[PDB]
Coordinates of C-alpha atoms and ligand atoms in Angstrom, one line a residue:
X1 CA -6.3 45.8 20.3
X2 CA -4.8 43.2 18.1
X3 CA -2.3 41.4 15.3
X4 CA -2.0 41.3 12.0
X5 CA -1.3 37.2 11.2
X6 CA 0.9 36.8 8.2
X7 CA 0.5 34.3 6.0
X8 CA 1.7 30.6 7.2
X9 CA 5.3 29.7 6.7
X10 CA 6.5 27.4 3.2
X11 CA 8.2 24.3 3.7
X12 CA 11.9 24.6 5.3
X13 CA 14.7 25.1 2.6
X14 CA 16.3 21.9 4.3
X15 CA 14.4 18.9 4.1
X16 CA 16.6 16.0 4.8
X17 CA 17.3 14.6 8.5
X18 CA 19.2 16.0 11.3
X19 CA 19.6 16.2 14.6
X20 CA 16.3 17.6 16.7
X21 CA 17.1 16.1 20.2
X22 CA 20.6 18.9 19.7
X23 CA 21.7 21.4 22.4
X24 CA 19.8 24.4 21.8
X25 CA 16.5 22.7 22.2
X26 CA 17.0 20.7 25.5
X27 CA 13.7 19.2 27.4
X28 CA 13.1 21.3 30.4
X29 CA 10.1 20.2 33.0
X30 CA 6.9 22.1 33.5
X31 CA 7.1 25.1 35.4
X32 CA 3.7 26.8 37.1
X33 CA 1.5 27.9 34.4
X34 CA 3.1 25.9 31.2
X35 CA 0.4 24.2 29.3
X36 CA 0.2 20.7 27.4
X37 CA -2.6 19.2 26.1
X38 CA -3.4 15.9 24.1
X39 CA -1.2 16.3 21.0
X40 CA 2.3 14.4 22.3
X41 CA 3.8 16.2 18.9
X42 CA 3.0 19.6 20.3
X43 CA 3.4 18.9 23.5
X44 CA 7.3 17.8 22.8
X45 CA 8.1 20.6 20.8
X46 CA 6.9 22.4 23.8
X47 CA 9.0 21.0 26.4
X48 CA 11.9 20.8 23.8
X49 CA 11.5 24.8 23.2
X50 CA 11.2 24.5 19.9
X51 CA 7.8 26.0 20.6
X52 CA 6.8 28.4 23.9
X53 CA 7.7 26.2 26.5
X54 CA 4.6 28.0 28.2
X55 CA 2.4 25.9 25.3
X56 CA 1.0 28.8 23.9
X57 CA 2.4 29.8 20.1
X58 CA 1.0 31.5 17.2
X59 CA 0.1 29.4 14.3
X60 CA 3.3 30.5 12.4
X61 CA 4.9 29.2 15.4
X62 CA 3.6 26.0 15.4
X63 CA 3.9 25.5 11.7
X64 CA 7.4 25.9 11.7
X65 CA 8.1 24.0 15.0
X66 CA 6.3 21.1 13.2
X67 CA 8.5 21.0 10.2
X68 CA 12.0 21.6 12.3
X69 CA 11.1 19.0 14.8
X70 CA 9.5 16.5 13.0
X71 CA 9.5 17.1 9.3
X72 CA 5.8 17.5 9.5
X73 CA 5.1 18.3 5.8
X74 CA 4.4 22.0 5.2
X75 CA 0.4 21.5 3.7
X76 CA -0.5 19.2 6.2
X77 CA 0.9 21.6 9.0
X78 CA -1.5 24.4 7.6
X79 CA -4.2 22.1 7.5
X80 CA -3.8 20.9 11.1
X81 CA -2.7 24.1 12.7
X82 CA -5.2 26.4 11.0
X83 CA -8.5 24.1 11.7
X84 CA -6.9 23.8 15.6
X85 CA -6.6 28.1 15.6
X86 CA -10.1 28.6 13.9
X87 CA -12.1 26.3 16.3
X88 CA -9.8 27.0 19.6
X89 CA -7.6 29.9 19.4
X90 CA -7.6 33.7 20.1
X91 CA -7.6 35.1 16.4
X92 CA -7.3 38.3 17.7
X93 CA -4.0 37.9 19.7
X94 CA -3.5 35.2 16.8
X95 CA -2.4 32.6 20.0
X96 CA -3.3 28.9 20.2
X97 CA -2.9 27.3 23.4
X98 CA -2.2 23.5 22.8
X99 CA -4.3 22.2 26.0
X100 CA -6.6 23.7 27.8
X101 CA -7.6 27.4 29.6
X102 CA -5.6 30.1 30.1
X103 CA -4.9 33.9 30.1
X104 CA -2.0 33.7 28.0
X105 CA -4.2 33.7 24.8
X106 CA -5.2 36.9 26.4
X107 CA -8.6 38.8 26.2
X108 CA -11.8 35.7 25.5
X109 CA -13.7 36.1 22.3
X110 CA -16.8 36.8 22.5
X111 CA -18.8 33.4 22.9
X112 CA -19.7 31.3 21.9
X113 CA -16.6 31.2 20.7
X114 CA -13.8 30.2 23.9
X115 CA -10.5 30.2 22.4
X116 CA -10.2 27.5 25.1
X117 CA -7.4 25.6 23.5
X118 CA -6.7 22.0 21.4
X119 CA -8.0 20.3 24.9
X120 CA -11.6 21.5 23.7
X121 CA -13.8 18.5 22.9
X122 CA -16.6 17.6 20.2
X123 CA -15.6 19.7 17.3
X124 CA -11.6 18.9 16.6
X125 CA -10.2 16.7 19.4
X126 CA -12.3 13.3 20.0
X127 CA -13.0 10.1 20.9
X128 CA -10.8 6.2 20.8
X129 CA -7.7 8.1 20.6
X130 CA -4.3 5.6 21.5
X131 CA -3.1 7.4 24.9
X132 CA -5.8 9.6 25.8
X133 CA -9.1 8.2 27.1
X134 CA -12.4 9.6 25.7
X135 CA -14.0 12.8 27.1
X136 CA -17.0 11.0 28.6
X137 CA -14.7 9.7 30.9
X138 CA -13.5 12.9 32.5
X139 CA -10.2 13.2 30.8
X140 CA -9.4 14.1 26.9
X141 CA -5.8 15.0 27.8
X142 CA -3.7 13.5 30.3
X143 CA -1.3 10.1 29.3
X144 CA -3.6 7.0 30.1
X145 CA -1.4 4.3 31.3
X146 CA -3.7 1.8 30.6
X147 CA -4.3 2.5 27.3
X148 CA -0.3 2.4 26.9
X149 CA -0.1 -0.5 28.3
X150 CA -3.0 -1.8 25.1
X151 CA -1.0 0.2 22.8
X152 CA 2.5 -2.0 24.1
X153 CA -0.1 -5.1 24.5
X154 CA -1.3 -4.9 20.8
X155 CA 2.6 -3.7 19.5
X156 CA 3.5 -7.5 21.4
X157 CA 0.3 -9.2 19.4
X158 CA 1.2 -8.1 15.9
X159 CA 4.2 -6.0 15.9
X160 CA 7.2 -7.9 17.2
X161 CA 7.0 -5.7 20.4
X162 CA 7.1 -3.0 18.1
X163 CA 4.5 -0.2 16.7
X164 CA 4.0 -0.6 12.4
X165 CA 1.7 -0.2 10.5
X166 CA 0.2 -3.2 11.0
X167 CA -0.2 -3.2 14.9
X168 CA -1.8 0.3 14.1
X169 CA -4.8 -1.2 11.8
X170 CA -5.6 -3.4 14.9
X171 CA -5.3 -1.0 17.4
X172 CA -7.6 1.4 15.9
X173 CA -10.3 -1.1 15.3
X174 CA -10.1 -2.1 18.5
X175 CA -10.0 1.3 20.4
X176 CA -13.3 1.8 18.7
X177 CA -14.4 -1.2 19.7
X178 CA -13.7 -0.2 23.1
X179 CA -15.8 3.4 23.2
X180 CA -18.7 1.8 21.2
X181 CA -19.0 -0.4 24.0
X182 CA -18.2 1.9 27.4
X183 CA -19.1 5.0 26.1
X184 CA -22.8 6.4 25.4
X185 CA -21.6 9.7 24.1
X186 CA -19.1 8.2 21.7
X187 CA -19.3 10.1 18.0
X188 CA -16.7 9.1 15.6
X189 CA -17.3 11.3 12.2
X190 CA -16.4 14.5 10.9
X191 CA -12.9 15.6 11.9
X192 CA -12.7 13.2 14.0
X193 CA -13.0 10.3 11.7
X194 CA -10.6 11.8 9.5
X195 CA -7.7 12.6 11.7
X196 CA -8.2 8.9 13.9
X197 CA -6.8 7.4 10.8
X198 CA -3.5 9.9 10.8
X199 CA -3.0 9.9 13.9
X200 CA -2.5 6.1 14.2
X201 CA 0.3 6.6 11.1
X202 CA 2.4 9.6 12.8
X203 CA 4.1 7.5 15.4
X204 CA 5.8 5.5 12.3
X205 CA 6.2 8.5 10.1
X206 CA 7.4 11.1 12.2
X207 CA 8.6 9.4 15.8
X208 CA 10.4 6.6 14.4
X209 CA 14.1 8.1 14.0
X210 CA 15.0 9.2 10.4
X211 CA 18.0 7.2 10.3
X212 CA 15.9 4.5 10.3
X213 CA 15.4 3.6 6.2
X214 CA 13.7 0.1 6.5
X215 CA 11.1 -1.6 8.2
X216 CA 9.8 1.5 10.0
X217 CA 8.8 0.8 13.7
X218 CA 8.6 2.4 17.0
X219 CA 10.4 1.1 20.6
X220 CA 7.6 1.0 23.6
X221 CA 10.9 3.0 25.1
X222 CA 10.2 5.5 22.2
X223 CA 7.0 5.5 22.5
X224 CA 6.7 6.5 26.0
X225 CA 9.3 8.9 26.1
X226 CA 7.3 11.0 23.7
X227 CA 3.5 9.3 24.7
X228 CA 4.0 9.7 28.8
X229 CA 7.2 12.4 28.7
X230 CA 6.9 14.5 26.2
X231 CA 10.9 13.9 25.4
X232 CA 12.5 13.7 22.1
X233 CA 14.5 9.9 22.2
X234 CA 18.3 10.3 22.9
X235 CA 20.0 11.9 20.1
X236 CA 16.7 11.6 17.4
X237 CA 17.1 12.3 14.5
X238 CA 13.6 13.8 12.5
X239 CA 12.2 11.8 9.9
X240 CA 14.4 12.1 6.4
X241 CA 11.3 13.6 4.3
X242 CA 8.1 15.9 5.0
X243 CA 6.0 13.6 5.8
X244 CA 2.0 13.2 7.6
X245 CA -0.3 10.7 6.8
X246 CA 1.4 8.0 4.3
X247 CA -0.1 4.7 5.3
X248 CA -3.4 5.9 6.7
X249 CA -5.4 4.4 3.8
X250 CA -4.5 0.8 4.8
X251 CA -4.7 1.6 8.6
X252 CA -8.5 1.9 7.1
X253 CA -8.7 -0.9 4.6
X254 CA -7.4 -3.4 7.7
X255 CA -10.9 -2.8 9.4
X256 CA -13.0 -0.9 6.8
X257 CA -15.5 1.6 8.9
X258 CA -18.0 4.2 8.5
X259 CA -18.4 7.3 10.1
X260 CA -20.9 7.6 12.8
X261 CA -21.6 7.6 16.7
X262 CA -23.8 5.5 19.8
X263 CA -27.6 6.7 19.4
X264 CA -29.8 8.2 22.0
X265 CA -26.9 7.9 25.0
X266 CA -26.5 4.0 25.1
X267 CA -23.7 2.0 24.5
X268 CA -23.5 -1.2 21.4
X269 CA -25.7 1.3 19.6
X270 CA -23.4 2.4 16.6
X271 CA -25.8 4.6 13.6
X272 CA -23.8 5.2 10.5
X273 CA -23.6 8.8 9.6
X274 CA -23.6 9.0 5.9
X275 CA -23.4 13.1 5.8
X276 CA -20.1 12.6 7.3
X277 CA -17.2 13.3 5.9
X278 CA -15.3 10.5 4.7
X279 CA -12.0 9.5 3.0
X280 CA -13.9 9.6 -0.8
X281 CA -15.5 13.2 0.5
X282 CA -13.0 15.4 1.9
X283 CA -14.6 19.0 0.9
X284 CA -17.3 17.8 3.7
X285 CA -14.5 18.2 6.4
X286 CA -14.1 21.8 5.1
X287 CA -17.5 23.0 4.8
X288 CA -18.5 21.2 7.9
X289 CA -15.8 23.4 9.8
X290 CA -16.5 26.2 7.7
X291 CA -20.0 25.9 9.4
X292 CA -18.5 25.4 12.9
X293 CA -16.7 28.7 13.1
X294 CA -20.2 30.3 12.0
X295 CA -21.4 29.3 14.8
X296 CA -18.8 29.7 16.8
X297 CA -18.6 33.8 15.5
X298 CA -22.2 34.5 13.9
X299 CA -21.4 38.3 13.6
X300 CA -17.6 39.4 14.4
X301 CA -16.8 43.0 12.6
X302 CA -13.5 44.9 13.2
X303 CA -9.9 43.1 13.7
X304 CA -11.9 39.5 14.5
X305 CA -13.8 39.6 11.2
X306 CA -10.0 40.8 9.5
X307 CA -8.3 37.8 10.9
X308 CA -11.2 35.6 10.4
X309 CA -11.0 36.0 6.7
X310 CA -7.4 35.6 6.7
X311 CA -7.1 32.2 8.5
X312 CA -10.0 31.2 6.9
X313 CA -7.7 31.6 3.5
X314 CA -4.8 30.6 5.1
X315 CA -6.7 27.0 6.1
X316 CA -8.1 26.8 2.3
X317 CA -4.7 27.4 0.9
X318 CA -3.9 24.1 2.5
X319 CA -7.2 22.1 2.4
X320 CA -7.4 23.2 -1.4
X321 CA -4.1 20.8 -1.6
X322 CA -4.6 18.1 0.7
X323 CA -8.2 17.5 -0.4
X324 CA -7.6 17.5 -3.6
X325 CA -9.3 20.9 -4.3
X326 CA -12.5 22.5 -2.7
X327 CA -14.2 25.4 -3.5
X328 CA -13.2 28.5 -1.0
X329 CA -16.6 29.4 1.0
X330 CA -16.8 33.3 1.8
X331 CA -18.9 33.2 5.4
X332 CA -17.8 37.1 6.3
X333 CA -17.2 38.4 2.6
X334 CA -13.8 39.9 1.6
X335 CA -11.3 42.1 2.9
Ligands
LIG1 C1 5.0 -5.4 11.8 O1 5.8 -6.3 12.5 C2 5.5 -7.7 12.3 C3 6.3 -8.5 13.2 O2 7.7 -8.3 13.0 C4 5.7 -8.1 10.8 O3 5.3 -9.4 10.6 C5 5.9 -10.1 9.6 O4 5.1 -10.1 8.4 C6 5.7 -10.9 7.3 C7 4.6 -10.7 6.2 O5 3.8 -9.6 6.4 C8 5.9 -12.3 7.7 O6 6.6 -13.0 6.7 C9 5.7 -13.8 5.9 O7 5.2 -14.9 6.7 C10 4.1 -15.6 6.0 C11 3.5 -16.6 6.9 O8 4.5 -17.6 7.3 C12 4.1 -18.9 7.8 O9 3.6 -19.7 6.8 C13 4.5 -19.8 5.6 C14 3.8 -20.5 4.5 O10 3.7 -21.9 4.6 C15 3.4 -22.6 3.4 O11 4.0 -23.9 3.3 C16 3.6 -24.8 4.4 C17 4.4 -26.1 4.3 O12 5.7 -25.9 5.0 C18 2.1 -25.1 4.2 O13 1.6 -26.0 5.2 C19 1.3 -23.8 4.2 O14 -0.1 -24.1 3.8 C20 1.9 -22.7 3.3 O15 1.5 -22.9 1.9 C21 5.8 -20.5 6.1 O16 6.8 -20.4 5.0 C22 6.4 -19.9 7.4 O17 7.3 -20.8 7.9 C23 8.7 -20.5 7.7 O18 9.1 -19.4 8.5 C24 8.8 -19.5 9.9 C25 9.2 -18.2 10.6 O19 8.1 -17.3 10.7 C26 9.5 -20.8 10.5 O20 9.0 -21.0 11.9 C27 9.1 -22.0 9.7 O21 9.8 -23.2 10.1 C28 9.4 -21.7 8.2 O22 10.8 -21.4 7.9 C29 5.3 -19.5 8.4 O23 5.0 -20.5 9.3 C30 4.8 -16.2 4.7 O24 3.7 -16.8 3.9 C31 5.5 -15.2 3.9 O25 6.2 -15.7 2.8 C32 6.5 -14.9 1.7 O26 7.8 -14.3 1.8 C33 8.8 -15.3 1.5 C34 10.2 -14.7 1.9 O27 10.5 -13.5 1.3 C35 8.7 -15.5 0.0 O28 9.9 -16.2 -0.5 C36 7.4 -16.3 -0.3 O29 7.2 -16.4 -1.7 C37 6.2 -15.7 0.4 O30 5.5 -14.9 -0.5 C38 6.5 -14.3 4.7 O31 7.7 -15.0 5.1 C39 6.7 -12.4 9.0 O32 6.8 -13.8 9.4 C40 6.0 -11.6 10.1 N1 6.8 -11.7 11.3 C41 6.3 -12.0 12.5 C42 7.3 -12.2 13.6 O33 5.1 -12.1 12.6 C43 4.8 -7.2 9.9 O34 5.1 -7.3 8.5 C44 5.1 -5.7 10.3 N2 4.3 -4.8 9.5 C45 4.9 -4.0 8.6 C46 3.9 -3.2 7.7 O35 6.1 -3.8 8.5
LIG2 C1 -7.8 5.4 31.4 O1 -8.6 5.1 30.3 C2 -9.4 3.9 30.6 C3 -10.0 3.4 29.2 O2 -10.9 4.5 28.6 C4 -10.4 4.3 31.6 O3 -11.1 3.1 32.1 C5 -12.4 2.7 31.6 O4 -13.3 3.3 32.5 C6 -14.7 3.1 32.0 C7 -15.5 3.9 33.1 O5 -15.0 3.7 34.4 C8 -15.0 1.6 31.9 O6 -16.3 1.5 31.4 C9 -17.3 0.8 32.1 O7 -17.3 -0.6 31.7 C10 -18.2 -1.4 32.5 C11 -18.0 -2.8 32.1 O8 -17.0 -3.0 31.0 C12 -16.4 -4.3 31.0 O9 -16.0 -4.6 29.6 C13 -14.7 -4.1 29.2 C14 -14.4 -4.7 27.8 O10 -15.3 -4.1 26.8 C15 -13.6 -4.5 30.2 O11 -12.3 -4.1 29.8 C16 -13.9 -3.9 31.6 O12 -12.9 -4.3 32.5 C17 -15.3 -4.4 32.1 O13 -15.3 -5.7 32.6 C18 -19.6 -0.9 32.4 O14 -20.3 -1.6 33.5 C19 -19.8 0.6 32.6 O15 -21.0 1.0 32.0 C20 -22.0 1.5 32.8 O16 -22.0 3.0 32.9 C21 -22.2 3.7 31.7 C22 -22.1 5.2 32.1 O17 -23.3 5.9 32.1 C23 -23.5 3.3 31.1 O18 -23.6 4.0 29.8 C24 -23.6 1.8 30.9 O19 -24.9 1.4 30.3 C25 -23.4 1.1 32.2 O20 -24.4 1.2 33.2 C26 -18.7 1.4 31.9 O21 -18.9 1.7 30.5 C27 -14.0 1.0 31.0 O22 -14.2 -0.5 31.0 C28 -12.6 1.2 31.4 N1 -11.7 0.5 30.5 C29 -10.6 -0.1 30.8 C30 -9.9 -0.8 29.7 O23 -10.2 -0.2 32.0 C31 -9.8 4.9 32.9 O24 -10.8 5.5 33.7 C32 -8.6 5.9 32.6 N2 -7.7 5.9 33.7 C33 -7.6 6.9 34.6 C34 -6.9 6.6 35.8 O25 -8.0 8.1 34.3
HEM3 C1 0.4 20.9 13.4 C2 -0.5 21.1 14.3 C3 -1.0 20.0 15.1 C4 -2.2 20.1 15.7 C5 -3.1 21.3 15.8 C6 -2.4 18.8 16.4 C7 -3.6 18.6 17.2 C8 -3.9 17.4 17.8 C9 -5.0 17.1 18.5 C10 -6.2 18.1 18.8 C11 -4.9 15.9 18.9 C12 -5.9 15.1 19.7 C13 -6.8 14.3 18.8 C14 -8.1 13.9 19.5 O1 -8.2 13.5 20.7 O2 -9.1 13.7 18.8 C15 -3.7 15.3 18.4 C16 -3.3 14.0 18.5 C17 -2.1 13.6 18.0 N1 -1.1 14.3 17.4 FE1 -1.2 16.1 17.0 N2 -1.4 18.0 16.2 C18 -0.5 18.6 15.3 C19 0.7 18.2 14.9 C20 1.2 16.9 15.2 C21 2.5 16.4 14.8 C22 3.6 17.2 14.1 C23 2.5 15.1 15.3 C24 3.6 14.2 15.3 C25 4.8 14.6 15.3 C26 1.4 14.9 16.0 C27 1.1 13.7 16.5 C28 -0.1 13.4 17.1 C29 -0.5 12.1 17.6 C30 0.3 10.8 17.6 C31 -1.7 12.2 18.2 C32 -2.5 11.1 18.9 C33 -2.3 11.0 20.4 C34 -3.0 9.8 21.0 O3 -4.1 9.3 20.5 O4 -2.5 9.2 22.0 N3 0.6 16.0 15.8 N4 -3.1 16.3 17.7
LIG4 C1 -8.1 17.3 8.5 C2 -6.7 16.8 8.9 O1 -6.2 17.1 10.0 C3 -6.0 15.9 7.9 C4 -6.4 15.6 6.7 C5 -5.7 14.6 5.8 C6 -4.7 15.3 4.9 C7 -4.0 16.5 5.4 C8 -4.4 14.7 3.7 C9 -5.0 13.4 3.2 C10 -5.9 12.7 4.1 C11 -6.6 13.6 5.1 C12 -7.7 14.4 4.4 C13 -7.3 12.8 6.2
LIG5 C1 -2.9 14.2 8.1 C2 -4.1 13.5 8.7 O1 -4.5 12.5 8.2 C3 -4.6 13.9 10.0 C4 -3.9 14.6 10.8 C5 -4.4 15.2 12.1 C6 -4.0 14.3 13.2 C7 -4.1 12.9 12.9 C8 -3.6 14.8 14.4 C9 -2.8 16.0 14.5 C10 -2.6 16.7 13.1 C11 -3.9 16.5 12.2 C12 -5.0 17.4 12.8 C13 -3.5 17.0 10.8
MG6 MG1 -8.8 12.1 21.9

């Protein structure tokens, strides 16, 4: 009939770096049934059991798998796993899968809502990602070798044969480049504008071993262990402070660009959006989503419109932080 989802976890009483690669959390392969999807965070924690190995975890779960793995800090944990639940989980059984389809979220929502996991396109996961190719093309979740072999190419160009911060301002640019020009369907705003520009920034902040104090920057060995493998490197140590995002901003100000999408199904057609969401107008991002899950559940009552409301707090409790405060919309009232 349902759960009652508590509030999401606080940030872990230890903060500092340790050992997450450690005996108690050793990468196992796939067995029948175990879902990944296009998040190689998720999808290590997964295969590292520091989430269901199945792929399939409550958002209290994930939160907290986030932070011990990776040090993922504790606001930008509720921001990511909340918006990911709302849009794509079960808020009934208060399960998330982290790809695609499957019956261990148990009973469907009624739709238009799917609870068909993060591998669910338009809304949260998009286009010009680093290792996954865009949707258009048939597959939003699977490792891309060629685009690893870009992503190694363009670490060679302006990296040192390593990924920083720097290689990840040109990559971006470029990726968009790339699905301006080959893909017709290509949107880039919204969510998706937003979390492109983390994303590029996690593989220095979180996969480059904690030990590491200076000159942050990640191996092509690294990189594919976690990227292709979903594996933890040999004996890795987590980042040495919560940490998301740092750096995004001048991932950005490399190749300054404005949210948007190719027009009317053809590609080297690129419209600015300017009702987007941007990095100056956070509070769009939330009342755009806000909007999404309306439409997603246009008249839940009982348990769904219970645990509606509470995510929907839970997600503000973080966005309220990270975006420097927005005012809490009330879609389905009160308790
Ligand atoms: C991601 O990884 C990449 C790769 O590891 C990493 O890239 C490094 O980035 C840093 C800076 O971001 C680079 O270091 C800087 O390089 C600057 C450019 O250097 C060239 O030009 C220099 C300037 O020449 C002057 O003088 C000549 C006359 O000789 C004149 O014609 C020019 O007009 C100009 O006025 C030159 O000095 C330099 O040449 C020396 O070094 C090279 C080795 O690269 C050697 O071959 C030469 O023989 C010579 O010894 C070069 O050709 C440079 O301007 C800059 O200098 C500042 O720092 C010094 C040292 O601290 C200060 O004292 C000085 O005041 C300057 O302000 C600096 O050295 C580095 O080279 C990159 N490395 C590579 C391999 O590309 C990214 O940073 C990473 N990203 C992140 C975020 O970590
Ligand atoms: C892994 O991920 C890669 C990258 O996303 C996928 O490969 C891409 O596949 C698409 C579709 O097959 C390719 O797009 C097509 O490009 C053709 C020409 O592009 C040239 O220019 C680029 C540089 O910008 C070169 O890199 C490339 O080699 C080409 O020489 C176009 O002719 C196609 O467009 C036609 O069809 C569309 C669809 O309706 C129309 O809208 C167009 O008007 C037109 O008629 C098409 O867009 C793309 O180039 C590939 N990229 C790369 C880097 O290879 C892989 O599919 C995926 N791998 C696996 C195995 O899944
Ligand atoms: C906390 C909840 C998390 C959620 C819900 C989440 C969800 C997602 C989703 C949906 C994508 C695909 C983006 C797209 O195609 O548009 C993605 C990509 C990514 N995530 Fe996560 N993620 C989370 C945490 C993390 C953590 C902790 C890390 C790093 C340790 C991480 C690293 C990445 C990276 C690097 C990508 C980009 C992959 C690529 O482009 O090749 N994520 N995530
Ligand atoms: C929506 C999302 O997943 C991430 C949002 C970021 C956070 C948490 C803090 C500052 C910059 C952003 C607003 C892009
Ligand atoms: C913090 C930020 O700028 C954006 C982050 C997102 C990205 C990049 C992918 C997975 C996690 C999020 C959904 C938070
Ligand atoms: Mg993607």
């Amino acid at each position: 009939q349902g759960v009652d989802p508590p509030p999401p976890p606080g940030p872990p009483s230890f903060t500092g770096t340790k050992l997450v690669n450690d005996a108690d959390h050793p990468w196992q392969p796939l067995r029948e049934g175990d879902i990944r999807g296009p998040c190689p965070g998720l999808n290590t924690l997964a295969s590292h059991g520091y989430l269901p190995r199945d792929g399939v975890a409550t958002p209290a779960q994930i939160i907290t798998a986030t932070q011990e793995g990776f040090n993922f800090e504790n606001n930008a944990a509720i921001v990511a796993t909340y918006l990911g639940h709302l849009l794509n989980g079960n808020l009934v059984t208060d399960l998330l899968s982290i790809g695609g389809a499957t019956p261990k979220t148990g009973p469907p929502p009624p739709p238009p809502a799917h609870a068909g996991g993060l591998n669910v396109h338009g809304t949260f996961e998009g286009d010009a990602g680093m290792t996954r190719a865009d949707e258009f093309f048939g597959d939003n979740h699977s490792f891309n070798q060629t685009l690893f072999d870009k992503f190694v190419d363009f670490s060679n160009r302006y990296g040192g044969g390593f990924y920083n911060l720097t290689v990840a301002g040109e990559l971006r640019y470029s990726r968009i480049q790339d699905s301006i020009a080959t893909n017709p369907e290509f949107q880039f705003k919204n969510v998706r504008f937003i979390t492109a520009y983390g994303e590029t920034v996690f593989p220095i902040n979180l996969f480059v071993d904690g030990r590491v104090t200076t000159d942050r920057k990640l191996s092509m060995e690294d990189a594919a262990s976690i990227f292709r493998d979903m594996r933890f490197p040999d004996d890795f140590h987590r980042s040495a402070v919560p940490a998301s995002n740092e750096g995004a901003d001048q991932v950005l100000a490399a190749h300054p660009w404005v949210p948007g999408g190719n027009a009317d199904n053809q590609v080297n057609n690129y419209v600015e959006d300017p009702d987007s969401a941007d990095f100056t107008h956070l509070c769009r991002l939330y009342e755009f989503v806000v909007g999404s899950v309306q439409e997603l559940y246009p008249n839940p009552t009982g348990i769904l419109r219970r645990n509606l409301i509470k995510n929907l707090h839970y997600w503000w409790t973080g966005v309220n932080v990270a975006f420097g405060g927005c005012d809490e919309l009330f879609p389905y009232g009160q308790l």
